[PDB]
Amino acid sequence: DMLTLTRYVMEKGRQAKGTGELTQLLNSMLTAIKAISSAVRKAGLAHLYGIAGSVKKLDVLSNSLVINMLQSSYSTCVLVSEENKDAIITAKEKRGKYVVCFDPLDGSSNIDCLASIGTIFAIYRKEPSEKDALQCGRNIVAAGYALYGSATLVALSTGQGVDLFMLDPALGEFVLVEKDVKIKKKGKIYSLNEGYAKYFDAATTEYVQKKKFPEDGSAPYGARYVGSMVADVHRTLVYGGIFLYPANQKSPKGKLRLLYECNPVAYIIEQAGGLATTGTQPVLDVKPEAIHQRVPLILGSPEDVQEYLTCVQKN
Amino acid sequence: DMLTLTRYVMEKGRQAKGTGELTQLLNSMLTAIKAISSAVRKAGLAHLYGIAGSVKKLDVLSNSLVINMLQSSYSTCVLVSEENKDAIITAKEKRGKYVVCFDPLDGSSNIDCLASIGTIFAIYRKEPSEKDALQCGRNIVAAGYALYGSATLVALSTGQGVDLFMLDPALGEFVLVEKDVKIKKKGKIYSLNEGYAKYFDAATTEYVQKKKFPEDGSAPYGARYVGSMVADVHRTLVYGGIFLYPANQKSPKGKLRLLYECNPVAYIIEQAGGLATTGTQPVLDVKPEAIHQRVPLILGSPEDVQEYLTCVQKN
Amino acid sequence: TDMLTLTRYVMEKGRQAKGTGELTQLLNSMLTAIKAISSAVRKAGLAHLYGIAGSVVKKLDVLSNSLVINMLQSSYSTCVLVSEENKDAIITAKEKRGKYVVCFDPLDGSSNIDCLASIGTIFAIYRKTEPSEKDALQCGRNIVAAGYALYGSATLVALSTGQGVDLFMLDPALGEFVLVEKDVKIKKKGKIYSLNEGYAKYFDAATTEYVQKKKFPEDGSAPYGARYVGSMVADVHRTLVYGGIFLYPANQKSPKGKLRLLYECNPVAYIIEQAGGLATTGTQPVLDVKPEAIHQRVPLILGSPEDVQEYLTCVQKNQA
Amino acid sequence: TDMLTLTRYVMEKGRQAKGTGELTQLLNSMLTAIKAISSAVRKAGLAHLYGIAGSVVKKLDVLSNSLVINMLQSSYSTCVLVSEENKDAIITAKEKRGKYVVCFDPLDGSSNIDCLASIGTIFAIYRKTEPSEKDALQCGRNIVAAGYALYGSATLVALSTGQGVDLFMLDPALGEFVLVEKDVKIKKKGKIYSLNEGYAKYFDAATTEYVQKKKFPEDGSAPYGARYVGSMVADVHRTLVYGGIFLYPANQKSPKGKLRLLYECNPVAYIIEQAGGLATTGTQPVLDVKPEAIHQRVPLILGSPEDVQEYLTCVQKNQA
Ligand SMILES: Nc1ncnc2c1ncn2[C@@H]1O[C@H](COP(=O)(O)O)[C@@H](O)[C@H]1O
Ligand SMILES: Nc1ncnc2c1ncn2[C@@H]1O[C@H](COP(=O)(O)O)[C@@H](O)[C@H]1O
Ligand SMILES: Nc1ncnc2c1ncn2[C@@H]1O[C@H](COP(=O)(O)O)[C@@H](O)[C@H]1O
Ligand SMILES: Nc1ncnc2c1ncn2[C@@H]1O[C@H](COP(=O)(O)O)[C@@H](O)[C@H]1O
Missing domain, CATH: 3.30.540.10 (Fructose-1,6-Bisphosphatase, subunit A, domain 1)
Structure with missing residues (x-):
């Protein structure tokens, strides 16, 4: 009103x-x-x-x-x-x-x-x-x-x-x-810098493969990556899907910052019915240890984030 | 002045x-x-x-x-x-x-x-x-x-x-x-929707592989894709690299429009010292046959576009 | 504050x-x-x-x-x-x-x-209420x-x-x-007077006398300058920040004034009073008029207190 | 056009x-x-x-x-x-x-x-040149x-x-x-006059006579309204679009006028003339004054032609 x-x-x-x-x-x-x-x-x-x-x-x-x-x-x-x-x-x-x-x-x-x-x-x-x-x-x-x-x-x-x-x-x-x-339960966009594929872990590699080459007769997901976190996270909120900056060989703690990047967008996405995780625990449950601490970040539609976590637990 | x-x-x-x-x-x-x-x-x-x-x-x-x-x-x-x-x-x-x-x-x-x-x-x-x-x-x-x-x-x-x-x-x-x-002679960003990888031709698949997994000791390229052609093409102009919406199995004539999308940005990129091609000829040399004709589009730093064409001619 | x-x-x-x-x-x-x-x-x-x-x-x-x-x-x-x-x-x-x-x-x-x-x-x-x-x-x-x-x-x-x-x-x-x-805070005394002198033919004696004294002072001082945008907010705001006097008094063609009590005169009288100025109908403060109808008109004279006092003096003298 | x-x-x-x-x-x-x-x-x-x-x-x-x-x-x-x-x-x-x-x-x-x-x-x-x-x-x-x-x-x-x-x-x-x-095109005759009447004590006879006739007409018509923002562009623009007259004549304290010939009076005289109005110093068109120095002042009277004519008439009569 x-x-x-x-x-x-x-x-x-x-x-x-x-x-x-x-x-x-x-x-x-x-x-x-x-x-x-x-x-x-x-x-x-x-x-x-x-x-x-x-x-x-x-x-x-x-x-x-x-x-x-x-x-x-x-x-x-x-x-x-x-x-x-x-x-x-x-x-x-x-x-x-x-x-x-x-x-x-x-x-x-x-x-x-x-x-x-x-x-x-x-x-x-x-x-x-x-x-x-x-x-x-x-x-x-x-x-x-x-x-x-x-x-x-x-x-x-x-x-x-x-x-x-x-x-x-x-x-x-x-x-x-x-x-x-409210974020869609499941979307059709995956968002990450595939320029780091050489450095991904097994789970990330397998997850991205499933998006591009599905086995269940579904259409491959579309890819988007602005390389500007707020833009990619906002698109994930309003269109659905998944956004990822996981740890990789070159950024082993992840790249995005916990206090003033990851926690705020995790809070927004969860409030909207989505999920946000480091790949080993929810972002909002990470006990910060330093103010400029980095963490991995995977967030978006809950069913998509859940598929990612299922790949992580596999590998 | x-x-x-x-x-x-x-x-x-x-x-x-x-x-x-x-x-x-x-x-x-x-x-x-x-x-x-x-x-x-x-x-x-x-x-x-x-x-x-x-x-x-x-x-x-x-x-x-x-x-x-x-x-x-x-x-x-x-x-x-x-x-x-x-x-x-x-x-x-x-x-x-x-x-x-x-x-x-x-x-x-x-x-x-x-x-x-x-x-x-x-x-x-x-x-x-x-x-x-x-x-x-x-x-x-x-x-x-x-x-x-x-x-x-x-x-x-x-x-x-x-x-x-x-x-x-x-x-x-x-x-x-x-x-x-003037566009850089060679950049370090590649820009395309990898959500279509299932439908790429051999050349495109091989080119993207080389960007992610180089053989000459160079760092992999970074990936960006806004999914808004002017944004991706403008970033290619000012930062260098390559932008692609090639033909694929599902869009065999390409997706972008020749008259009012591809020709104008090809003209800008070439004026800036870059290259723009359908993969079989320069975009600006395509003789249009209908006003809403689609064509494939690959453009950007000349050395990058040249590497793409070299993959095309190979396959 | 901050x-x-x-x-x-x-x-x-x-x-x-x-x-x-x-x-x-x-x-x-x-x-x-x-x-x-x-x-x-x-x-x-x-x-x-x-x-x-x-x-x-x-x-x-x-x-x-x-x-x-x-x-x-x-x-x-x-x-x-x-x-x-x-x-x-x-x-x-x-x-x-x-x-x-x-x-x-x-x-x-x-x-x-x-x-x-x-x-x-x-x-x-x-x-x-x-x-x-x-x-x-x-x-x-x-x-x-x-x-x-x-x-x-x-x-x-x-x-x-x-x-x-x-x-x-x-x-x-x-x-x-x-x-x-x-x-x-408004100046105690200004050097500008503001009214439509095109109603001179219709003015009461007090207004005529006041205006005459602004142009031909009796105290050896320079005449006041005149300004009248003809948009009340603009004239009242200048009066607030430069000092002086603004008037739209009753006249023969507008015997109860022209400006509206509820939503023109009361608000600016409140602002002017709050800034240490005076706002009068000529016979009492604008803020004391008991409204009888929502589009009631009232005369309005407001601005620096020494100036408004000089106008009220013309009124009482010419009314006696 | 289009x-x-x-x-x-x-x-x-x-x-x-x-x-x-x-x-x-x-x-x-x-x-x-x-x-x-x-x-x-x-x-x-x-x-x-x-x-x-x-x-x-x-x-x-x-x-x-x-x-x-x-x-x-x-x-x-x-x-x-x-x-x-x-x-x-x-x-x-x-x-x-x-x-x-x-x-x-x-x-x-x-x-x-x-x-x-x-x-x-x-x-x-x-x-x-x-x-x-x-x-x-x-x-x-x-x-x-x-x-x-x-x-x-x-x-x-x-x-x-x-x-x-x-x-x-x-x-x-x-x-x-x-x-x-x-x-x-400016109206042939307006119903507003615009000048600082705070210089009344210093006016020449012609200006005094003109202003007096705007307030107390001799022809059975209503007096003109008065407006004076005190910013020349605002007053001249209103004169253009509503008609009437704007003046800053010579007076005892400003015997050559106050406004500047090269970059205030000439430009607005040109605009007013181009719109079918008149712009005078009181003795000749502003546009005919041969400038002698770049910050030269000149008297300025401009606006609807019947009004400016009535002012020029006061001038010639009082100068004879
Ligand atoms: N504008 C607001 N919107 C939503 N919640 C609020 C707002 N202001 C206060 N609250 C809630 O009430 C608490 C106390 O507010 P405060 O007294 O202003 O510190 C906050 O910590 C919030 O949980
Ligand atoms: N503003 C401009 N900038 C660059 N070139 C121009 C411009 N105006 C005209 N030209 C060139 O001169 C030609 C003739 O211009 P026109 O006479 O306006 O049709 C154009 O087709 C352009 O090649
Ligand atoms: N924002 C404000 N500025 C100044 N006074 C206020 C403000 N808000 C409330 N007041 C004063 O407190 C009274 C009651 O406020 P309210 O409960 O909001 O109706 C008002 O009638 C004012 O006198
Ligand atoms: N944009 C215009 N509008 C009106 N008159 C113009 C314009 N441009 C040029 N003129 C007239 O043509 C003359 C010569 O123009 P120029 O060659 O641009 O100095 C000017 O002094 C004006 O009288």
């Missing part, structure tokens, strides 16, 4: 009988995301190219947008960013009770070819230190992502399923476009 | 000692592209969702934008659109000498997952009929594409190499960001 | 007031309608009306009204709305009913749309919050919830209002 | 004139600077100044000036520029030199930025093209290249100016 993400989030906080602290935190995150979308679409580019006579930065700017909007919310005590070596402890004067792990601009190596890129975040309730960010994903309070693709979208869950919002740039607000989205 | 695409195109027409007719045509195309970018990013979405009490269309709108901007230019006599069964003959009162083939919104099945999508066009100099659009790609006067990705970009050539422009949404104009772009 | 955006700022003020979140949702709703109106006023989508895809004022009035009514009703915070555009009060559907009453002019500055002059949106919010138009007939002393949006060279909102006036500017690249001045 | 956008329209007019494309490139350049200025006036990027990423008027003047100067110089169409913001004429670098001279006010309406009133950009283009400021001292009769942008509730450009006045509105969703009225 509420139409805009601002009114929707407020109304959900009123229903939760919250003090307004998490609401201010979500308000601040979403404001950072609007500022990042504006910069990603290249507002102001002409000034860069000398229109007024004056002729990686996006990484730094997006990081600064999130850090400053979150710290000034008075809702946080600890932040972990993909862009910072150490946890960032909120100034005592501005301390609230939430911990936020985020990748402010994910996929951002691919800005050069203008691929879809995004922002990922997970929020936890907490003397503050990096240990406060080492909670397993089962403890998530809220999480979500922004996708800067053909349009700008946010996926958000606070524990009651997944809602989708799209940014209307004429209005400057996110509009609710889908409530309580 | 000219900074904006409008001034650049005008200055190029002055240098060509043109009558202004092709310039008005390019002006009209670019205006259509700005209108499409605005709609693709979802300006006005909130009005759709009832903000004022009033609660495939993008395909139709983009088609109408291009057709109306081109016809009203007074520069055209024949249009071919991906969206129309028959060629569209310009009203005699508005007739000029150019023929335009275009796909007004390509990749547009993928709007639902917000994948990058685009607009592709090729322009020919011409009693007008569909036969006027059946010229081989060697006859192209100008061609290019718009990519609606993390930002909006245009690639444009009028026969003197490829220039890249980016839309600054704060200014409302395209800004020149790269002049005379 | 809140930076209007959204965080309004939320935080609601937290401090220990509200239930109902007035916050109402204010969020109004401000969303104001952003939608700004977009339309600046003519987003004009090219489509002029046939870019092959298909070629009252418009904008109706649209702006529909934006405000729908955003307010769907907030679940309202029971009664009064609009400049509707003859009767609009009663909120019972299942959406909350406790607030909103009086608004969704797009003020009619004489000016066609020449692109600055125009605006004006509103005042009351708490209800079964709902009916009588809930909107409260004197301005009962205002809970009030404000205006100015669609000028940039889009600005002035808002007060009873602790002074704060000014916010819309950053169109961000899509949000940014706090640019907190607790603004 | 051209729809300002870009196609200007290109097509250049094709019809059989130009080399040099004036077209100059006009494209000016219009790009105007879009960049509109974006900045509406405060794109404000949130970044206020610290959204941790980093917290004269500004806008300098920016707008730099936008116009760089876009014009890089067109390769110019040899001499005169700006309201620069003491001396600006000579184009020899390797960028073309044949046109441009006089402009990059951001007119200073008294109004802070209160967000409508403001604008004004320009006039001449063909050169080695380049120096003398190439800018041509009377307005030699104008090749002239125009203004109004940053009001929406952004509008008025442009004439000598075949009447066309009006274009910026669609900010598209990023282009759209033709909204071709060959606009």
Whole structure:
């Protein structure tokens, strides 16, 4: 009923009988995301190219947008960013009770070819230190992502399923476009970098073979891989299927990051009725041991993820 | 020096000692592209969702934008659109000498997952009929594409190499960001739907094997496939490598369309020093026989395309 | 504060007031309608009306009204709305009913749309006292919050919830209002006077005497400058930020004034008073007028207190 | 025509004139600077100044000036520029030199930025007669093209290249100016008069007599309405589209007028004349004044011809 993400989030906080602290935190995150979308679409580019006579930065700017909007919310005590070596402890004067792990601009190596890129975040309730960010994903309070693709979208869950919002740039607000989205039980797309096939384990090799060469008279799955995690994960949510960045010979711990990439999208996919696993346990059950820890990631439609796990247990 | 695409195109027409007719045509195309970018990013979405009490269309709108901007230019006599069964003959009162083939919104099945999508066009100099659009790609006067990705970009050539422009949404104009772009002689990315491997020919199977399992001590290529042709072709241009939608058992004539998909991107890639082939001849040398003809498409860095052709000739 | 955006700022003020979140949702709703109106006023989508895809004022009035009514009703915070555009009060559907009453002019500055002059949106919010138009007939002393949006060279909102006036500017690249001045105070005395002197023939003696003294001062000072955009929000906002006086007094052709008490004069009188200025009908504060009908007119004289005092002095002298 | 956008329209007019494309490139350049200025006036990027990423008027003047100067110089169409913001004429670098001279006010309406009133950009283009400021001292009769942008509730450009006045509105969703009225003609007689009556004490007899007749007509008609935004582009544009009269005459404190001949009065006089109106100093057409210095001031009275005639009549009578 509420139409805009601002009114929707407020109304959900009123229903939760919250003090307004998490609401201010979500308000601040979403404001950072609007500022990042504006910069990603290249507002102001002409000034860069000398229109007024004056002729990686996006990484730094997006990081600064999130850090400053979150710290000034008075809702946080600890932040972990993909862009910072150490946890960032909120100034005592501005301390609230939430911990936020985020990748402010994910996929951002691919800005050069203008691929879809995004922002990922997970929020936890907490003397503050990096240990406060080492909670397993089962403890998530809220999480979500922004996708800067053909349009700008946010996926958000606070524990009651997944809602989708799209940014209307004429209005400057996110509009609710889908409530309580559920992933297909089984899809027909598989998504991984097959350029690593030389380094796969046996299970992964066998699983990919079954997708391309089925034995049960079914059509082979179609393949997609943007190489931008938010884009591939969002397509998996809305179309169904499976997304994988498993461990391989060259990346034995996996490549994607547990705190601010894997846990947030695992939380979204599970809230949507999907599964997300390292191949040996659910991602949300991994007890994090360091803030920039890598883990393997396999997620999507539950029947597809289940077939993958069945290959793993075989081999 | 000219900074904006409008001034650049005008200055190029002055240098060509043109009558202004092709310039008005390019002006009209670019205006259509700005209108499409605005709609693709979802300006006005909130009005759709009832903000004022009033609660495939993008395909139709983009088609109408291009057709109306081109016809009203007074520069055209024949249009071919991906969206129309028959060629569209310009009203005699508005007739000029150019023929335009275009796909007004390509990749547009993928709007639902917000994948990058685009607009592709090729322009020919011409009693007008569909036969006027059946010229081989060697006859192209100008061609290019718009990519609606993390930002909006245009690639444009009028026969003197490829220039890249980016839309600054704060200014409302395209800004020149790269002049005379040249593709790498050899890249390290291969791009195709391996979900069709069951249906590949021997050459394609062998080529993909060599990318994943090289014999000369080199690292395997990385794999990318957005499944949106403009996005994959633009990444091939700026990063190098190879893009393929070859014929297969299920699509024996190929899938992509010669007039308004394959010829325009072949023209751009060759202008940039790359190669584009059906696997039996250069795309730009194919003599079109029908306006919605399909052809196989293999293009990108010349050494990569050459390795592919060497596999084809082998098998 | 540190809140930076209007959204965080309004939320935080609601937290401090220990509200239930109902007035916050109402204010969020109004401000969303104001952003939608700004977009339309600046003519987003004009090219489509002029046939870019092959298909070629009252418009904008109706649209702006529909934006405000729908955003307010769907907030679940309202029971009664009064609009400049509707003859009767609009009663909120019972299942959406909350406790607030909103009086608004969704797009003020009619004489000016066609020449692109600055125009605006004006509103005042009351708490209800079964709902009916009588809930909107409260004197301005009962205002809970009030404000205006100015669609000028940039889009600005002035808002007060009873602790002074704060000014916010819309950053169109961000899509949000940014706090640019907190607790603004009007100058004690200005140097601009603002009224339509084309009604000179119809003025009362007091107005004639006051205007004459602005042009031909008796104290050795320079005459005041004159400005009159003819769009009340633009003139009142300049009065707020530069000081001076704005007037649309009663005259022979408009013996009760021209401007509307509920949704033009009360809201701006509240803003001006909250900023340390004065707002009078000429005989009493605008905020003390007891409304008798929802489209009632009243005379309006407002701005810097020394200036409004000099005008009231002309009134009492000429009335004695 | 059918051209729809300002870009196609200007290109097509250049094709019809059989130009080399040099004036077209100059006009494209000016219009790009105007879009960049509109974006900045509406405060794109404000949130970044206020610290959204941790980093917290004269500004806008300098920016707008730099936008116009760089876009014009890089067109390769110019040899001499005169700006309201620069003491001396600006000579184009020899390797960028073309044949046109441009006089402009990059951001007119200073008294109004802070209160967000409508403001604008004004320009006039001449063909050169080695380049120096003398190439800018041509009377307005030699104008090749002239125009203004109004940053009001929406952004509008008025442009004439000598075949009447066309009006274009910026669609900010598209990023282009759209033709909204071709060959606009001012009313023969209006019902609005526009001047700063705060200078009444300093007026000449003619101005005093004229203003008195607007408020107290002698012919049984209703008095004229008054409007005065105090930003010349806004007042002149309203005069164009609603009719009536706009004045900033000489007065005792400004005996040669206040507004600037080269880049305020000549351009708008050209626009007004092209639309069938009159523009006078009070003693001769503005376009006939032979400029003697690049920041020369002149009195300006312009608008509907019957109104300007009634003002000129007051002048001749009171001068006899
Ligand atoms: N806007 C919201 N949406 C959903 N849940 C919320 C919201 N605000 C608060 N909650 C829930 O209530 C708890 C307490 O909120 P808070 O008092 O603001 O820290 C949160 O940790 C959430 O579980
Ligand atoms: N803006 C332009 N950029 C590059 N080449 C152009 C341009 N305008 C015209 N030409 C070239 O000159 C030819 C004649 O132009 P036209 O007289 O406008 O039909 C074209 O077919 C192009 O080869
Ligand atoms: N966001 C706010 N800003 C200022 N005052 C507020 C706010 N929200 C609530 N209040 C005050 O608290 C009262 C009750 O709030 P509510 O429970 O939301 O109706 C209001 O009528 C205001 O006086
Ligand atoms: N785009 C245009 N619109 C109207 N008149 C033009 C245009 N371009 C050129 N002209 C006229 O033709 C003359 C010579 O043009 P140019 O060769 O571009 O300097 C100009 O000084 C104008 O009088």
